[PDB]
Amino acid sequence: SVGIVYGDQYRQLCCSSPKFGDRYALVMDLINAYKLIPELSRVPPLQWDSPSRMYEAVTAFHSTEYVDALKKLQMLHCEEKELTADDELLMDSFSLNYDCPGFPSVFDYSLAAVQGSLAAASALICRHCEVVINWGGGWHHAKRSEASGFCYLNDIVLAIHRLVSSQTRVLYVDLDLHHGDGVEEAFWYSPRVVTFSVHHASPGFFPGTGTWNKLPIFLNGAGRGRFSAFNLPLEEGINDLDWSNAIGPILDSLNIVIQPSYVVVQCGADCLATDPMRIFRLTNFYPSLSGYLYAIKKILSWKVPTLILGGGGYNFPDTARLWTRVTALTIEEVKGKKMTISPEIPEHSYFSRYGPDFELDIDYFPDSIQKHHRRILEQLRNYADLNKLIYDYDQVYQLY
Numbered sequence: 001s002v003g004i005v006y007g008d009q010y011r012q013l014c015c016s017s018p019k020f021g022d023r024y025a026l027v028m029d030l031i032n033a034y035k036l037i038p039e040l041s042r043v044p045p046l047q048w049d050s051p052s053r054m055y056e057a058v059t060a061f062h063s064t065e066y067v068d069a070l071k072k073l074q075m076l077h078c079e080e081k082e083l084t085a086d087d088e089l090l091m092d093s094f095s096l097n098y099d100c101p102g103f104p105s106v107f108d109y110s111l112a113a114v115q116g117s118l119a120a121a122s123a124l125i126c127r128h129c130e131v132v133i134n135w136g137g138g139w140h141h142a143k144r145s146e147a148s149g150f151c152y153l154n155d156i157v158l159a160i161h162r163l164v165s166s167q168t169r170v171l172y173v174d175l176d177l178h179h180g181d182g183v184e185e186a187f188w189y190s191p192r193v194v195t196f197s198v199h200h201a202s203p204g205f206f207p208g209t210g211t212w213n214k215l216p217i218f219l220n221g222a223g224r225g226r227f228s229a230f231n232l233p234l235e236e237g238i239n240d241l242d243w244s245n246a247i248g249p250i251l252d253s254l255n256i257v258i259q260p261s262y263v264v265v266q267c268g269a270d271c272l273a274t275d276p277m278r279i280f281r282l283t284n285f286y287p288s289l290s291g292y293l294y295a296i297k298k299i300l301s302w303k304v305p306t307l308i309l310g311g312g313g314y315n316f317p318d319t320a321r322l323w324t325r326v327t328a329l330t331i332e333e334v335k336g337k338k339m340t341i342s343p344e345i346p347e348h349s350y351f352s353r354y355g356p357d358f359e360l361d362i363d364y365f366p367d368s369i370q371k372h373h374r375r376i377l378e379q380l381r382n383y384a385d386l387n388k389l390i391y392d393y394d395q396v397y398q399l400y
């Protein structure tokens, strides 16, 4: 069975931020308009019995003083008065500024994604769900004591920590246009959480990591975590087929060698050709085959309990078009039951947002990688030697 995180308060909170507006509502309302919701188990966001218990849960990763600052920032924005000079400095010391400014529900907003992704992890753990989807989650840039790139709390790190604390290994697959730096950093010394981000990287492009660091090299973990952080940076303009061929053997190799207890997928939609980022040229096409659908179906064929999370996506109706299809694909791959998605957007509350033509398909007409494959294959060998893992080196070598 397949779970999905939602709830009336949750929706309202996920829709309160200035950057993402009502995107989460478009997503869930298109999933509902396509009659996918009777197929899905609703997973409610986690709630706590005390302030101390919520605090304990968030400070499994974030610092107490950072959580204090984020909660004070919300309070400060629930009043009319400007911030004082001392409070401006306090917020600045946590990067609670720039692309992560305050607003009246910033703490509740950030916490909501944490509640969602922790209940999604718990559902996988008690085996209630084989796969769980949280399109209100996936905020991979937040750090221990630092907000970054619209991310204030790192719900993914907290979810992954709850999975490993239940020998357990987690594979994290980050499909966002941007390097998943917060999650990579959090598990930099941990062999039990292998992280893999594919992304655009180029000079000046946010956040700047996930690429070359004497000829330059890739850092890939430290201490017992050495070789446990994987990265594949790609050039702008890549299409579905080339991106699919680029990540396919890496994904298959990671599964064979690591044999994960769980997979966590960040499924940011800003690689889409129609995203205002306009960097990659992926689609939501399902006959070109969507790079996203290819990767998700491949991960699901492994039959490992899987958390599927949102992330970037700044063309809100096209993010909804993609994630609706990811959601139908998951139901199909898990229940064994075919889903039939009409190519035309069904009438519903946000139907006008899908003009001028109202189709499910997005409105688009479509050797470095080989060196990267040899580097990654060797890193996987090193990881597997360091961590005393058995594996047929010629079974993995033929995947490429």
Ligand SMILES: O=C(NO)c1cccc(-c2cn(CSc3ccccc3)nn2)c1
Binding pocket: 019, 020, 099, 141, 149, 150, 176, 178, 206, 268, 270, 276, 277, 311, 312, 313, 314
């Ligand atoms: O997705 C991300 N990280 O995973 C990420 C991180 C940092 C910056 C950006 C970003 C997005 N845009 C598009 S403009 C826009 C359009 C709608 C809403 C909000 C912004 N400009 N900068 C994205």
Ligand SMILES: [K+]
Binding pocket: 174, 175, 176, 177, 178, 179, 180, 197, 198, 199
């Ligand atoms: K990524």
Ligand SMILES: [K+]
Binding pocket: 187, 188, 189, 190, 191, 192, 193, 194, 195, 221, 225, 228, 229
């Ligand atoms: K790691």
Ligand SMILES: [Zn+2]
Binding pocket: 176, 177, 178, 268, 270, 311, 312, 313
């Ligand atoms: Zn992104």
